[PDB]
Amino acid sequence: NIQGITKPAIRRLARRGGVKRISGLIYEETRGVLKVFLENVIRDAVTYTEHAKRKTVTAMDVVYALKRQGRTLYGFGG
Amino acid sequence: RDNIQGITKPAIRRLARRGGVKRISGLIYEETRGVLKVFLENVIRDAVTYTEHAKRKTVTAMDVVYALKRQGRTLYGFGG
């Protein structure tokens, strides 16, 4: 869930994100931003899957979805 | 000639004020000219390339709109 993400996950994300230290409110803000980004991608991906009238959300659906926002992801049949 | 520095100081001051700026540094104008040099370079190069495709030495108002649409700066009210 949104609250299931742990502190060291965001800490190591910041470590790969070039941030040496992040405050307490950064944990909540990062969870919110990650959740809204996930919903933004998932809306398009699930809508594409529904238009195909199929249950299993294929990986290629993200490539079709992230193409709309110009952030296409390679390696999944592009 | 020397038209890069020929842009009047209050014009860039007006542009800074339109960006909601109350105190404007003296180097802001120079930085604005320096950035706008490349900003115009890219778009004009794309437009001239579009014109050069069609054996044209004159830029039409449609080619600029086409280049802006490709780049992601589509302009309204000017056709295209």
Next chain:
Amino acid sequence: AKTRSSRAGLQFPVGRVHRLLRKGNYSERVGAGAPVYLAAVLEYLTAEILELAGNAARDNKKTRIIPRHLQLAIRNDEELNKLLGRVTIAQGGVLPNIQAVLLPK
């Protein structure tokens, strides 16, 4: 009634809409009723823009629409500005944006 738009309760020409879809290298075939739906959607968008565009024009005691009012209407609304975030409208200017530190105490 002869035009296909009369039978669909619209006024966009279905023939013109389908003409670009055919001679635009979009697909092998395009539907005939699909242009009706697309024209309905486009007309709804035009009416939606015109509502607040005319409201803004009337509020300034300038009945004739000027591009400044169009820009204000487009960028003031959340949905319209979200659609046209990277879009600049001719002779429209920019949104009045004054923060707290700019205004003197």
Next chain:
Amino acid sequence: TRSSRAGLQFPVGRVHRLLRKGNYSERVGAGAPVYLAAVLEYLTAEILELAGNAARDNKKTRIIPRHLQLAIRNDEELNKLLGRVTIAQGGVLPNIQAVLLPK
């Protein structure tokens, strides 16, 4: 294919069929598919030339997606090409800011 007689590694006929499949235009000249194949081949050759040297840098022979990502991010024109396109298992080149370093 016809790429052998044209001195090109990437076959041209696949490019021609790719152009035909998408219905991007009613007709395409003969020079466009060979030119497109040549451009794609040159770009792939440059990328693989960078990737092979990158693999040799770490005393290695195999290439994983990380090597390709680092090769793309090393150059500036290629980084401009892949400015806002994400690569799976790519990552980011290491970058440590100065003010973060202890004094």
Next chain:
Amino acid sequence: SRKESYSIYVYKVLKQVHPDTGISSKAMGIMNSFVNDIFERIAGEASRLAHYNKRSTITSREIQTAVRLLLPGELAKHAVSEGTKAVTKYTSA
């Protein structure tokens, strides 16, 4: 020749929305560009999604889901609601 325009169509849209509000030629071109670029976006998405479906034709549900994906949520939903009535009226008549 005869370049097709939306001038009379824009006139009628105003007469259906703001009959007493005037329009300038600049606003005419702005509205023309708006209709044109939204049309291009929807048509391009329809072409891409038709290529995704291994199909050579475009249906109505394809256009509805294109509107849902592209246009903003509330705006897209209202557009779909207004377009379904038009599709039903066209089909029945």
Next chain:
Amino acid sequence: RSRKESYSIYVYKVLKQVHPDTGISSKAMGIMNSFVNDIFERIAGEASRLAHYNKRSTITSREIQTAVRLLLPGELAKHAVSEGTKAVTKYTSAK
């Protein structure tokens, strides 16, 4: 059952030409396929736009030649244009 098309051995042979003692992984073949297909998608879209904007139907070598100078930076685009023109001349002169 459909047999798709990829750049599995194409990329491997090009890498062999540029680096004979250099391997590649299973994921990298698919990633290279996606990369080249995306580049081709951009190039085809630009060719269609150039043909339609100039009121044309046949996309000759010149449309792609101009689209490369837009897609690639001036110097890299110049190299790509030179290689493509060489390939076009070789194709036209040969059978």
Next chain:
Amino acid sequence: PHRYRPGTVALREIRRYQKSTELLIRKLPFQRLVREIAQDFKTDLRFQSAAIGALQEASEAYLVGLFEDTNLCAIHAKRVTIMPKDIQLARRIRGER
């Protein structure tokens, strides 16, 4: 003849610029700048007035947006005056170098 403290007429000028929509920059200097910029790529060119006006409008809009981002950065750093390092911060994050 009287003088007010700084920050009085500056806000008046800001509101005057924002309220209106006409291009503040004079047409001729910017069109000559565009001519000089274009002369570097291809020589002996002719430029339509509408195209140059479109380029001017796009440049002004982009510069105003960049200056708004610069203002956001300046307020972020507990300041009001804008300096070029704000523009450097904004452009790299935007992705335009």
Next chain:
Amino acid sequence: HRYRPGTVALREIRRYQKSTELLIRKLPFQRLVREIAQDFKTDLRFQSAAIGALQEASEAYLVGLFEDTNLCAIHAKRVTIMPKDIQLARRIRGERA
């Protein structure tokens, strides 16, 4: 023993910017994605490749956002980031209105 503050964090930055290990584990991320997708349709199967693509895209974008946020925070002579820093980083690109 107790090191000087900040050195361990930079060492972690250096070792993570060169490693290909997944920072976010698959199970909580998959459960959150499933719960988010269930707001519209229930029992939505997601592929392993689809989940991998989602986590890779999220990590790449959020790492870029942290880099921009660190740039903003450093630009204000600060190291630990703030929600104002995140707001500026997200607003600079143009995603935030």
Next chain:
DNA sequence: CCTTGGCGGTTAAAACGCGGGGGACAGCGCGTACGTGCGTTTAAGCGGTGCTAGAGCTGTCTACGACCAATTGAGCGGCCTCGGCACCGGGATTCTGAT
């Protein structure tokens, strides 16, 4: 057959508590250029004005491209036994901090 479901469990991933002492932050001093006014310079706004260029449009000739009809060999689907690095055993050398 590519996806779903269940069932157990453990060291890597991570969770409460002491204490930090450098990092974050409020406030105080100080210097100089930026706000604000006008004096005076300016090539730009606006209007003529002469010329004219090359692209829009059209007559006209049409070359190679989509396609019919047919054809063949190599990249992909699928195998298989061996090698370049996965992975760890155990070692020397460079940092990081305390002194």
Next chain:
DNA sequence: ATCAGAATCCCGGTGCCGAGGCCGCTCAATTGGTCGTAGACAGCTCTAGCACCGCTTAAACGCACGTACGCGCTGTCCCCCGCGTTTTAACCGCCAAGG
């Protein structure tokens, strides 16, 4: 300067799993021949654009008056990490199995 306390990288042994080597394949690329429609050589044109040129009152360069914000200085507040010690879980290690 001057010491250790552990941190992380390299050499070597183990080995293993997929990367390529390689065979069958079938369809996709090649291509003889055929007819065509925007493509293109060439011409008519014709007005918006190129370019110059003159007049003038609104905008800009200069510059003083001064003072407040950016930078510096002094001091103060305290907090996610570093670690210690403890926490409990994502995926390994297994199966069935179904839509």
